[PDB]
Swiss-Prot record, chain B:
Protein name, per record: Glutamate receptor 2
Cellular compartment(s): Cell membrane; Postsynaptic cell membrane; Postsynaptic density membrane
Tissues where the protein occurs: Detected in forebrain. Detected in dendrites of neuronal cells. Expressed in the pyramidal cell layers of CA1 and CA3 and in the granule cell layer of the dentate gyrus.
Record remark on domains: The M4 transmembrane segment mediates tetramerization and is required for cell surface expression.
Complete-protein stretch covered: 25 to 177 of 883
PTM characteristics: Palmitoylated. Depalmitoylated upon L-glutamate stimulation.
Family affiliation: Belongs to the glutamate-gated ion channel (TC 1.A.10.1) family. GRIA2 subfamily.
Subunit structure: Homotetramer or heterotetramer of pore-forming glutamate receptor subunits. Tetramers may be formed by the dimerization of dimers. May interact with MPP4. Forms a ternary complex with GRIP1 and CSPG4. Interacts with ATAD1 in an ATP-dependent manner. ATAD1-catalyzed ATP hydrolysis disrupts binding to ATAD1 and to GRIP1 and leads to AMPAR complex disassembly. Interacts with GRIP2. Interacts with GRIP1. Interacts with NSF via its C-terminus. Interacts with CACNG2, PICK1 and GRIP2. Interacts with GRIA1 and SYNDIG1. Part of a complex containing GRIA2, NSF and NAPA and/or NAPB.
Function noted in UniProt: Ionotropic glutamate receptor that functions as a ligand-gated cation channel, gated by L-glutamate and glutamatergic agonists such as alpha-amino-3-hydroxy-5-methyl-4-isoxazolepropionic acid (AMPA), quisqualic acid, and kainic acid. L-glutamate acts as an excitatory neurotransmitter at many synapses in the central nervous system and plays an important role in fast excitatory synaptic transmission.
Species of provenance: Rattus norvegicus (Rat)
Amino acid sequence: NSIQIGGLFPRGADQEYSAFRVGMVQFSTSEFRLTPHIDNLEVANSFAVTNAFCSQFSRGVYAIFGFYDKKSVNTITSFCGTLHVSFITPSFPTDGTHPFVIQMRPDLKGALLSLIEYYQWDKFAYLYDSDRGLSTLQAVLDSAAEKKWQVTAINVGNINNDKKDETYRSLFQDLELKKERRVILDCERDKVNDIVDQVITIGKHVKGYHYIIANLGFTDGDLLKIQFGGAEVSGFQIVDYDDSLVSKFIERWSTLEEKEYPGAHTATIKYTSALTYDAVQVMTEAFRNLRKQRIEISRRGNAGDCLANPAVPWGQGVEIERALKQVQVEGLSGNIKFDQNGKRINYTINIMELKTNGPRKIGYWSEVDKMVLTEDDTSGLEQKTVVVTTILESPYVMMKKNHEML
Amino acid sequence: NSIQIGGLFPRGADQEYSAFRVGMVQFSTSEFRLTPHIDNLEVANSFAVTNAFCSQFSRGVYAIFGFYDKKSVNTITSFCGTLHVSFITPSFPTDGTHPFVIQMRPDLKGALLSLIEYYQWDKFAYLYDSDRGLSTLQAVLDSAAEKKWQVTA
């Protein structure tokens, strides 16, 4: 068999596309060839997105894989609600429930909540950006009652290159005026470096601060530059390079040629790109299930129309939606598995604490493994310095008679 | 001469559909007219709005009156942002400044904040409906810094 699949890919994602090609190379077989039909236009532009998605559906492809942004998700998924094109993405998961959508990125909100109990704060500052949705802002603010948290939320998103130096001044100066010292950030990874730059430039990384980065791939930036600061910058890892099942992929990826697969040669990979492997794997295993369960995707030569009027489904799409939801496999994010709504379960996430030797696993979390600690590793033992604070008035504490030399 | 115009109306927005026809009856004039082409299909989901847009655009309507929701709004604003066919709405103002969109319903945030200042409030619980857009929940949470409010949402 041969199986055309639509790529509604985001531009600026050469690493994701390289992971797509490496997944295709790994998983392709002459039994059923998952076949590219790929396009790349501005994901923020709902029109151009819809237009290309019509073009791809105008080939009658069996499934489409790609990425969207909150400027588009109730454009795209509304189409999956009508044309029943089965759809897979590891982008940010939606708050609602929709068949024909596979939400390959796990839900960050549960873990990030549980971490707040684990660090035991009644007070934190909270920056966020709009692009993954204000879903985390809502979820934590809804959760404000349960622990009676004080929370301040300041929209960092509208920071732009017109004034991206004095904005961060005024912003962090506001956190000095409230004297905020537990800081949650919810950006995309390719933003976090620009906040961390200003954090270092104005010194706000010494002991007393505590940081979280609300990304599943916390260890992607130049964390080593703030690794010396002394703030406990602590954040998540769905990717774990230590899993030998995964580490064999990490080896193969980092050894694959750097320029034919642009940016694949690094020892580390964005968890978006990593989930591209799991996504292509689930599409392959779903077409394999379809063939093994002996229901054929044998289909009329007519593509259909994304805007027939009234539009009408084609029934085999329901079979693809079953087949995809039936998948359970090992991958770069563990034993991945999906509910009947199209949202993952069993998704297990590690919590990394930036000790100065490097980010190390203080625990892991799942829906049933509620923040299971893994601090049995001894990095940090042998009595790090307890810093003692006090005052100098005679006689209670005084200088040594040789204090200028001591 | 007449100008052909499009219309979309939410199902159940029957008072607005009435007021629209009453407005057409009032402001139609001897020298020029409207030729409304109207749809009353779904609005709470992008598909219906998109199909109606294509139908009425293929009809060549030079302006459209209609409505949207945060679920559908991006679909409209991107379509008009590309195709130069304008859109006018009484729906909530978005965060965006797309051309071709006349977001008539005036800014409510400035007055809200100025009244909060007038009561000199310090600590209160703010509720919200998500689907009007969190632009207010943002613009009141933002100044919970500068105005040191103690909001809960």
